[PDB]
Design an enzyme around this catalytic site. Structure first.
Site: not given
Lengths: 213, 218, 194, 205, 232, 195, 233, 83, 214
Positions: I10-11
């Site tokens: 995730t980012t």
């Protein structure tokens, strides 16, 4: 998950006269191999010549003690009249019989003086139950100390030639001697020794220090 | 209940003029430094100070109930009454109840303060064991640091020789070097008899031979 | 241990019921019988958990007698069996553990007698004869072979005798023989055992 | 073995033209010990509508009685008859409540509506989902095999006399499948002018 | 027209009424002397086809506290059940003796439940219409208390309550003394009890009991009563 | 611990042992393992120390209500029945409790055996213990309804002595009672170590 | 008229906006015994009269040991008073358990008040018709309060309840300045005199009715009972 | 009647025998005074004659009345034209 | 959590500037090689000034987001003008805490008010409420930590920040994860809320990566 049982108990010794009693205890409190605190007794003066001690866990020990004290105050308010030792003896048990569901426990002992001009000491199991004593050692180191304590103080076994009757002075010498000896056989005994001496004049405290290594 | 974002190593002592407390500023999530430079310092009233270690979420929760205590009653609710010996007891009861539900908290807290003539430094744990002692350390600090501190604080005349900050400063450097689950920055706070003082962002000092022997980075 | 046998002749019902009176791990006394007489028209035998049997039996006795007095009438024993079955059916589902096997032995005044067997899954059946427990294994072959529908009264007494001799012979348990009951429309009598 | 299997049992229904048929087993033992070769597991509610239930026997007795309570009261309030469809629904609602608990039953409905003169069959599942049957209907533990036989034996047009042979042989094949020795079977042959009941002759041990 | 009312006088209505109900009942007499408490009562009779043998109104709460009750007799039957149990509960808890007075307080708490208002938690709409003379012996020796239907208790050494009470209490004064013999007393009691009566003096309408330390709570038998008659 | 009770010509002889506790060898006794239900009735501890203490005391209060209200003595049969129901509530919450409630009432000498399932059976010889089996051999030989009082005290006494070798939580002292129709009389307590 | 109307509504409001219920309550305080309260503000005393209904009785107490640093005198009916007293003792018990502090008697008194006031503010509750003089030795000294069943809480340096309260008040105002912050002995004499003013005064002073109760700097709750007041007379 | 019929049976289970007559009477009486003394109820206001035997041949006649009391009589008559 | 579990990268970050905050996040959620959810938003208006980035399990996050909206909607009509700071943060915390361990939400709440300026708060799994200078979130953080340490840029431009988030996120998805597709962004200022969208083919070959913000 998290524990519902932790040890913390010390070792205590209750000695019954016939007009006095002494209840003596180490200040050293430990669990296992790490030391919780190098001080504090588990013997306390409840007052009016009743001395009490609750061995098992510190968390339980403070709470019972505080709570009993209100039942005594309330009682006197309810009409002037006080609990005798025996009364107190029943009161602790009901609490325990409740706590049989609760997973933490303690090994309690009460001592004081009667109006028969002699000591009474009653000792409880950690489920409820009571018995009449003559002498009781409680805590960890108790099991080892007691046969010898029973014999030296008592002379009521089937393995001694004579009797002698107690003396206060004599009781004090024996008590120190047992504790000084206890210390190099446990890591639950040590540091200092707090003596509650119970007489009909009032309650006196004596302290002497012991070895550590 | 179970650890989430946690803090470790809160050190404290009592001294002539006050009590001194020190704590690093870290919010680790196992070993990821989620927060660097996070407080652990709750001033209680202005004359008592709570340093808290354990779960950080739980900490926030406790801060508010403490907060309600003084915004109530005709006069302030931690004014005329509520002494540190009282505040200590009140806190212990709160752990006790949680443990009885067996839906527990997960913090160890030090309540430090001044009474009115006497230093107050008292301990509470997740176990819920309550004591006052002149020296306390949490976490890793409880095992390692506390015998170093103890030499000074079990000898009562030698306490009297100095204001304590130096012992504290020194211990914290040894602590940072040996453990790298600890962060280079710390805050130190002193509660004096009438006043309260916080020294903000310090970083460990670089020793002489010790710096060659051992560093603080991985 | 637990065992109960029955046979319905067209004129009476003989049942074999369990005995104990000092049974722990030893025998020294046997005299007590896990049966309650439901009235004088119906008798009930039971086996299962020992505490649960008394607790169950007493509730059912208490109720049946109220209905008798209130109606001023008597229920059929068949009627009683479905009632008993309905109560036990609840229990099974619940947290409390009644899962005991019951035998309701009944005599119908103008319909002739009827014998009911109740299981611990709750199942009610009528059989001219059946049995349950350890006893059953040995007895049922005899019962099948020697019995023939609507046999005499005299024949039953001989047939029951054979059972005791088989139980002795093959050898099972550690306490000796059974207690036998006779249920009739002259009430309840007793068939003595050796 | 299972929560439905301690006394086993299977039930079949087949449809004919201008008639319908329901056949079933009988047997009650206690576990694997056969005490009796009787125990009806099919009941009817009004002449023509038949309901076959296949759980554990204990459950079956309780459920059959529940359906009686509901249906009687329902019938009374509307003051006119119940339909086959209506029974099917009712069963579903009851089936839904029992789903949390250990009463699991498979019903099968069969009947021929004679105030509408059409044949009607359905099967229902023990998670409560109704599935409207056609031409053949299965129930019991033996079902996988039974299904196999029903797909094979059937032929699109049937007369009560042919229908009788079909079920009989089906029933004959079915009793060999039991490990619980479920011996004894009944047939009901339904017409909108007559019902025949037949108990059939079969193996005996 | 509430009965949840306090009253404009501020003196509750219902309590006052109770005293009237009491004036309708019998006469019950108590003298406690230096050692021993005596309670005497009229259990009365009226018809010859009645068995007052059956009847009583002086009960022993326990073997060291007793009570005589007077007023709407059915209420007192409720009143005793609660008390008797409460005493017994203290024996389970501490296996020890209760004071006459402690027992009397416990029952007075229960005296206030009348109403459905918010000064009293409801269960009752009205109070108990009875007064009781509560006796006992303990380490505070023989004592006597008068339980007042006004849900309060006053201490006493001699008391009469009943229809005749106004006269009786006057009569009670001359004969009372701080020190008088127990046996002597019983004769003195008998005299007041005689005076009130219109119906025959027989041992089949009057009942005596005493408590003495040497023999517990004792109910006095017929043969004994007949002897007491002979002396006076 | 072994306690035993047997019925004979007149009354019941109830016998049990006791000892001081520490988990090792001793000869001093401590307290009683017989509960004085009423001045009439005896009940034995053959379950957990507390369970008995609490529950027997409770049954005992009910007797004191019942006697006061109804104005009669309580039946020993009634008292067993009352105990059993209560014992049944406690079932499904573990715990142990078993007793023998002994009595000599108007309706007869009666011994009821009570366990921790809440089963309750009436009897005339019972030995309960670990040592019960051993005690039983000794009882059985002596068993008669034609036995006189002096001899009975000895029957029991010897029976206990046999138990001392077998189990180490038996012995120390034996306390004996003979129950009459004006209460129990103790036959007194006899040290196991003697002969 | 409408006397019955005003009893029937506990929600009463009149054209003059009076609440009769309070009025009734006041008459009930005046019906009670005679009690005075006095404090120097380093010692506090209360002379209280304990009376007996008849000759063969003995006096009933109206001095209650509420706590071992706080106490009261009651003036009005005995039965209601018992009920209130349990609530206040238990409130003292949790203070001790939880907080381990005595707690200001001032703070305590105010809390009790609310819980009563709110049921007058709705259906149910009749007046309790006992007034109190509440004394206690707290952190800032002794303090004296008058609690009324009108929940009228006032701190006074001395006060009185009982018919002819006013009489004794006027003497208290006169002697007020003499009270200062000393002498035990003096406070009691003035009380004995003052108490005479409350009575009809045809009744002569007696040692069996009077009762003297003190709390002070190193004192807690003590009662002088019967004859015991003669030493200090 | 119903209250009595269950009550005899409660007793039948506990006491294992049927009880005295007086005892039965006391229960019914207790509800009646209970309904006066309690709020939001009132008694039926009926009066009865209770009679029977126990194991003994002593005959029992007890009288119940809705003043919440009970009593023994040798003879009794109740209702219209009693005098 | 209820019946999902995410095992991919995730980012997300919000980075503060003068005018306000700019938010960026990846699109699409995945559990394994099989695509759990295709290119989607989690940049959510629950107010016109107040936006959030949702992370974790889809079902939980969706439920939390509407619930706050209800409360703030009632609050807005009567008190008038909502600031992000104490007021958004607590309402999200209480739920995370109460629903405790059957709850998986990683939220960056970012908002812009002229009242105190823009703020950034980060909900971790414990629900600590922390005012951040700027924040990076997700599991892909581990990939970006090094970049930010190396570059040491400072000073913000709308344009400068857009490149900064673009290289970081792009890389994170590349090494590991199976999350990718579109990177979406909102620059929140007094102008209003400006929406940027960048395609997954226009988003590589960036640089720059501030760590001191001044």
């Amino acid at each position: 998950r998290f524990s519902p049982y932790v040890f913390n108990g010390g070792t205590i010794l209750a000695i019954a006269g016939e007009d006095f009693a002494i209840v003596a205890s180490d200040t050293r409190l430990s669990e296992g191999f790490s030391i919780h605190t190098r001080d504090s007794p588990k013997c306390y003066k409840l007052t009016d010549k009743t001395v009490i001690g609750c061995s098992g866990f510190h968390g339980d020990c403070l709470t019972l003690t505080k709570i009993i004290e209100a039942r005594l105050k309330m009682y006197k308010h309810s009409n002037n009249k006080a609990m005798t030792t025996g009364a107190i003896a029943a009161m602790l048990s009901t609490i325990l019989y409740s706590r049989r569901f609760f997973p933490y426990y303690v090994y309690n002992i009460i001592g004081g003086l009667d109006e028969e001009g002699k000591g009474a000491v009653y000792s409880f199991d950690p489920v409820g139950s009571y018995q009449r004593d003559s002498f009781k050692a409680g805590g960890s180191a108790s099991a080892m100390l007691q046969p010898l304590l029973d014999n030296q103080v008592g002379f009521k076994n089937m393995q001694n030639v004579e009797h002698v009757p107690l003396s206060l002075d004599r009781a004090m010498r024996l008590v120190k001697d047992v504790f000084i000896s206890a210390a190099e056989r446990d890591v639950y005994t040590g540091d200092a020794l707090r003596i509650c001496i119970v007489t009909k004049e009032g309650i006196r405290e004596e302290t002497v220090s012991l070895r550590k290594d | 209940q179970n650890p989430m974002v946690t803090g470790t190593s809160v050190l404290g002592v009592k001294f002539e003029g006050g009590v001194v407390i020190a704590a690093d500023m870290l919010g680790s999530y196992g070993s990821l430094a989620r927060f660097r430079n996070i407080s652990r310092i709750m001033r209680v009233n202005n004359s008592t100070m709570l340093g808290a270690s354990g779960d950080y979420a739980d900490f926030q929760y406790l801060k508010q109930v403490l907060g309600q205590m003084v915004i109530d009653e005709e006069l302030l609710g931690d004014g005329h009454s509520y002494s540190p010996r009282a505040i200590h007891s009140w806190l212990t009861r709160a752990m006790y109840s949680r443990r009885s539900k067996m839906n527990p908290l997960w913090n160890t807290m030090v309540i430090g303060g001044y009474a009115d003539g006497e230093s107050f430094l008292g301990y509470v744990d997740m176990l819920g064991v309550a004591y006052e002692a002149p020296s306390l350390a949490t976490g890793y600090g409880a095992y390692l640091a506390q015998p170093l501190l103890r030499e000074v604080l079990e000898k009562q005349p030698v306490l009297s020789q100095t204001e304590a900050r130096d012992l504290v400063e020194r211990c914290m450097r040894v602590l940072y070097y040996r453990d790298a689950r600890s962060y280079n920055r710390f805050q130190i706070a002193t509660v004096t008899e009438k006043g309260v003082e916080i020294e903000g962002p310090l970083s460990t000092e670089t020793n002489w031979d010790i710096a060659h022997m051992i560093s603080g980075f991985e | 241990m637990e065992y109960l046998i029955g046979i319905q002749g067209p004129d009476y019902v003989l049942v074999a019921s369990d005995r104990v009176a000092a049974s722990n791990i030893v025998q020294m006394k046997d005299d007590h019988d896990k049966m309650f007489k439901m009235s004088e028209k119906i008798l009930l035998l039971c086996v299962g958990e020992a505490g649960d049997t008394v607790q169950f039996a007493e509730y059912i006795q208490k109720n049946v007698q109220l209905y008798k007095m209130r109606n001023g009438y008597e229920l059929s024993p068949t009627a009683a069996a479905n009632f008993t079955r309905r109560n036990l059916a609840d229990c099974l589902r619940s947290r409390t553990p009644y899962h005991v096997n019951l035998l309701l032995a009944g005599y119908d005044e103008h319909e002739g007698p009827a014998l009911y067997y109740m299981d611990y899954l709750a199942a009610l059946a009528k059989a001219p004869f059946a049995a349950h427990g350890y006893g059953a294994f040995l007895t049922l072959s005899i019962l099948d072979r020697y019995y023939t529908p609507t046999i005499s009264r005299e024949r039953a007494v001989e047939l029951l005798r054979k059972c005791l001799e088989e139980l002795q012979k093959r050898f099972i348990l550690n306490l000796p023989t059974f207690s036998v009951r006779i249920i009739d429309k002259n009430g309840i009598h007793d068939l003595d055992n050796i | 073995m299972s929560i439905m299997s301690y006394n086993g049992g299977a039930v079949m229904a087949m449809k004919g033209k201008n008639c319908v048929a329901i056949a079933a087993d009988r047997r009650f033992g206690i576990q694997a010990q056969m005490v009796t070769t009787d125990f009806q597991k099919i009941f009817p509610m009004g002449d023509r509508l038949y309901i076959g239930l296949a759980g554990l026997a204990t459950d079956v007795q309780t459920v059959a009685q529940r359906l009686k309570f509901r249906l009687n009261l329902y019938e009374l309030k509307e003051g006119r008859q119940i339909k086959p469809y209506t029974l099917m629904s009712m069963v579903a609602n009851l089936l839904y409540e029992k789903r949390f608990g250990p009463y699991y039953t498979e019903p099968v409905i069969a009947g021929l509506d004679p105030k509408t003169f059409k044949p009607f069959i359905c099967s229902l599942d023990l998670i409560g989902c109704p599935m409207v049957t056609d031409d053949f209907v299965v129930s019991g533990t033996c079902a996988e095999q039974m299904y196999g036989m029903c797909e094979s034996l059937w032929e699109p047009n049937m007369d009560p006399d042919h229908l009788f042979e079909t079920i009989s042989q089906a029933m004959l094949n079915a009793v060999d499948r039991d490990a619980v020795s479920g011996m004894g079977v009944i047939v009901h042959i339904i017409e909108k002018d007559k019902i025949t009941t037949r108990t059939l002759k079969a193996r005996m041990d | 027209r509430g009965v949840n009312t306090f009253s404009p006088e501020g003196r509750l209505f219902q309590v006052e009424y109770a005293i009237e109900a009491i004036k309708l009942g019998s006469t019950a007499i108590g003298i406690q002397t230096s050692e021993g408490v005596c309670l005497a009562v009229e259990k009365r009779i009226t018809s010859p086809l009645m068995e007052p043998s059956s009847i009583e109104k002086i009960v022993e709460i326990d073997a060291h506290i007793g009570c005589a009750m007077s007023g709407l007799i059915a209420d007192a039957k409720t009143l005793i059940d609660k008390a008797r149990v409460e005493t017994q509960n203290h024996w389970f808890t501490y296996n020890e003796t209760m004071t006459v007075e402690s027992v009397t307080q416990a029952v007075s708490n229960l005296a206030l439940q009348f109403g459905e208002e918010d000064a009293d938690p409801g269960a009752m709409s009205r109070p108990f219409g009875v007064a009781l003379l509560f006796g006992g012996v303990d380490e505070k020796g023989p004592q006597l208390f008068h339980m007042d239907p006004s849900g309060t208790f006053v201490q006493c050494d001699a008391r009469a309550i009943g229809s005749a009470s106004e006269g009786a209490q006057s009569s009670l004064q001359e004969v009372y003394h701080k020190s008088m013999t127990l046996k002597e007393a019983i004769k003195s009691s008998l005299i007041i009890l005689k005076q009130v009566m219109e119906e025959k003096l027989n041992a089949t309408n009057i009942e005596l009991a005493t408590v003495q330390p040497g023999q517990n709570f004792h109910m006095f038998t017929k043969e004994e009563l007949e002897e007491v008659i002979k002396d006076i | 611990t072994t306690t035993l009770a047997f019925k004979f010509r007149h009354g019941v002889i109830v016998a049990a042992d006791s000892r001081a506790t520490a988990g090792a060898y001793i000869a001093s006794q401590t307290v009683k393992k017989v509960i004085e239900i009423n001045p009439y009735l005896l009940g034995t501890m053959a379950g957990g120390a507390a369970d008995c203490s609490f529950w027997e005391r409770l049954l005992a209060r009910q007797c004191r209500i019942y006697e006061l209200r109804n104005k009669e003595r309580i039946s020993v049969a009634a008292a067993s029945k009352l105990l059993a129901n209560m014992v049944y509530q406690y079932k499904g919450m573990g715990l142990s409790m078993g007793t023998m409630i002994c009595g000599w009432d108007k309706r007869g000498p009666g011994l009821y055996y009570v366990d921790s399932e809440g089963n309750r059976i009436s009897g005339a010889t019972f030995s309960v213990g670990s040592g019960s089996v051993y005690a039983y051999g000794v009882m059985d030989r002596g068993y008669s309804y034609d036995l006189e009082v002096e001899q009975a005290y000895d029957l029991a006494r010897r029976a206990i002595y046999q138990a001392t070798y077998r189990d180490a939580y038996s012995g120390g002292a034996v306390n004996l009672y003979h129950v009459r129709e004006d209460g129990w009389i103790r036959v007194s307590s006899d040290n196991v170590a003697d002969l | 008229m409408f006397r019955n109307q005003y009893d029937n509504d506990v929600t009463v409001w009149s054209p003059q906006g009076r609440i009769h219920q309070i009025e009734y309550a006041m008459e009930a305080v005046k019906q009670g015994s005679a009690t005075v309260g006095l404090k120097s503000k380093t010692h506090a005393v209360l002379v209280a009269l304990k009376r007996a209904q008849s000759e063969l009785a003995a006096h009933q107490k109206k001095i209650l040991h509420v706590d071992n640093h706080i106490g009261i005198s009651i003036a009005g009916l005995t039965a209601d008073a018992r009920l209130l007293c349990n609530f206040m003792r238990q409130e003292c018990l949790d203070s001790r358990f939880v907080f381990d502090r005595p707690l200001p008697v001032s703070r305590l008194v105010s809390l009790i008040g609310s819980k009563t006031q709110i049921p007058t503010q709705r259906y149910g509750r009749r007046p309790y018709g006992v007034g109190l003089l509440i004394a206690g030795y707290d952190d800032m000294g002794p303090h004296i309060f008058q609690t009324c069943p009108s929940a009228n809480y006032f701190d006074c340096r001395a006060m009185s309840i009982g018919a002819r309260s006013q009489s004794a008040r006027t003497y208290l105002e006169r002697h007020m300045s003499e009270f200062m912050e000393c002498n035990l002995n003096e406070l009691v004499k003035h009380g004995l005199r003052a108490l005479r003013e409350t009575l009809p005064a045809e009744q002569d002073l007696t040692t069996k009715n009077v009762s003297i109760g003190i709390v002070g700097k190193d004192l807690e709750f003590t009662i002088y009972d019967d004859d015991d007041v003669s030493p200090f007379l | 009647i119903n209250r009595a019929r269950v009550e005899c049976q409660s007793h039948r289970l506990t006491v294992e025998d049927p009880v005295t007559v007086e005892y039965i009477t006391r229960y019914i009486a207790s509800l009646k005074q209970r309904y006066t003394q309690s709020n939001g109820r009132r008694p039926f206001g009926i009066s009865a004659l209770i009679v029977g035997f126990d194991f003994d041949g002593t005959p029992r006649l007890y009288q119940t009345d809705p003043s919440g009391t009970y009593h023994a009589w040798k003879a009794n008559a109740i209702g219209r034209g009693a005098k | 959590w209820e019946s999902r579990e995410v095992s991919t990268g995730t980012t997300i970050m919000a980075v503060q500037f003068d005018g306000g905050v700019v938010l960026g996040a990846d699109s699409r959620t995945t559990t394994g090689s099989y695509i759990a959810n295709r290119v989607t938003d989690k940049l959510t208006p629950i107010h016109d000034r107040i936006f959030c980035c949702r992370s974790g399990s889809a079902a939980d996050t969706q439920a939390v987001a509407d619930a706050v909206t209800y409360q703030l909607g009632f609050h807005s009509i009567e008190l008038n003008e909502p600031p992000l700071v104490h007021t958004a943060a607590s309402l999200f915390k209480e739920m995370c805490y109460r629903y405790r361990e059957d709850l998986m939400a990683g939220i960056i709440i970012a908002g812009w008010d002229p009242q105190e300026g823009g703020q950034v708060y980060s909900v971790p799994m414990g629900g600590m409420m922390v005012r951040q200078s700027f924040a990076i979130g997700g599991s892909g953080s581990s990939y970006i930590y090094g970049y930010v340490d190396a570059t040491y840029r400072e000073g913000m431009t709308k344009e400068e920040c857009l490149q900064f988030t673009a290289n970081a996120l792009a890389l994170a998805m590349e090494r590991d994860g199976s999350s990718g597709g579109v990177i979406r962004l909102a620059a929140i200022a007094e102008s209003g809320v400006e929406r940027q969208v960048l395609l997954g083919d226009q988003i590589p070959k960036f640089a720059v990566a501030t760590l001191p913000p001044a």
